[PDB]
């Protein structure tokens, strides 16, 4: 991808995640925990289904026979028919090869963008309380239990409650 998140500063994926495409993983004094996200998975799945619905359908135009395969026809017209058919086949062979590569290129960039957006959204709500480390996750400078992690996951985290303790820990 050209957003530099998947196969970028995130080293590898997780094979234990079986109920989503993106998720969290937390560690505190009590222990470890894992969950999954819903919005980004839904967006990616919706885009994929839209592409599939757009692509998979056949035409409704009807064609008939113009030559015979039991008794041949006059040569001067059969040559023209063969020439025209061979001319059309090349165009129809070129179009598909272009289109498939186009869609394949688009999909991966879409997925990378979704991952980057999730990362930025999570980053923007821990202002002045957590520090980045460069491998895709954050270090918190105060004491956070399971309920605080749960509030972080579902967008109900208030940064004013822990600001003074986190700032005092970070400055010294």
């Amino acid at each position: 991808g050209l957003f530099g998140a998947i196969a970028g500063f995130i080293e590898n994926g997780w094979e234990g995640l079986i109920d989503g495409w993106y998720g969290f993983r937390h560690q505190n004094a009590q222990g470890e925990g894992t969950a999954a996200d819903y919005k980004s998975t839904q967006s990616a799945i919706d885009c994929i289904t839209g592409k599939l619905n757009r692509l998979i359908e056949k035409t409704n135009q009807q064609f008939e026979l113009i030559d015979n395969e039991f008794t041949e026809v006059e040569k001067q017209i059969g040559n023209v028919i063969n020439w025209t058919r061979d001319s059309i086949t090349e165009v129809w062979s070129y179009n598909a090869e272009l289109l498939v590569a186009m869609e394949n290129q688009h999909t991966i960039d879409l997925a990378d963008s979704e991952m980057d957006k999730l990362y930025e959204r999570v980053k923007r709500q821990l202002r002045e309380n957590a520090e980045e480390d460069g491998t895709g996750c954050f270090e918190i400078f105060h004491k956070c239990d399971d309920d605080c992690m749960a509030s972080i996951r579902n967008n109900t985290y208030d940064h004013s409650k822990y600001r003074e303790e986190a700032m005092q820990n970070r400055i010294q």
Partner: peptide
């Protein structure tokens, strides 16, 4: 001393396709 990380899923064996530049 708390930490929260982010990631994505993966599979053991995948499929090979063609893109615009590979």
């Amino acid at each position: 001393a708390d930490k929260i990380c982010l990631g994505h899923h993966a599979v053991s064996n995948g499929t090979k396709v063609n893109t615009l530049c590979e």
